[PDB]
Swiss-Prot record:
It comes from the Eukaryota. The active site is at 35, 52. Belongs to the glycosyl hydrolase 22 family. Lysozyme C is capable of both hydrolysis and transglycosylation; it also shows a slight esterase activity. It acts rapidly on both peptide-substituted and unsubstituted peptidoglycan, and slowly on chitin oligosaccharides. It is found in: Secreted. Disulfide bonds join 6-127, 30-115, 64-80, 76-94. This is Lysozyme C. Substrate binds at residue 101. It comes from Gallus gallus (Chicken).
Amino acid sequence: KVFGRCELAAAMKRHGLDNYRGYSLGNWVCAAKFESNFNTQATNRNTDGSTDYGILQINSRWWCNDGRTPGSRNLCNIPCSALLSSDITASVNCAKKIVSDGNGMNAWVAWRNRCKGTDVQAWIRGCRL
Ligand code: NA
């Protein structure tokens, strides 16, 4: 599924991501925009052989099991395929653990390079939330 901006903002709120670990909803929507372009089916192969999955491009190196990332962990205790669902619950639950890991949203390199310090409120501007 390809969400609209305000539609994803609403789904993220419903799933308790708004202000989670102090990151406003705009921070989560901006991250999703540049990670997946709001596409829940996005997959991208990393040079190390890990894969990134879903709206927030969660990496098989640490967080999900895809069966093909040697030496990896599965800290969200999920198949990486559950991160490709039109229902964002699994991606949200696993993003909550990632952002709690110590480096906040710097874990998403697209967030650090493209969202951090910007007017992230623009991402939720005019949304009925
Ligand atoms: Na893994």
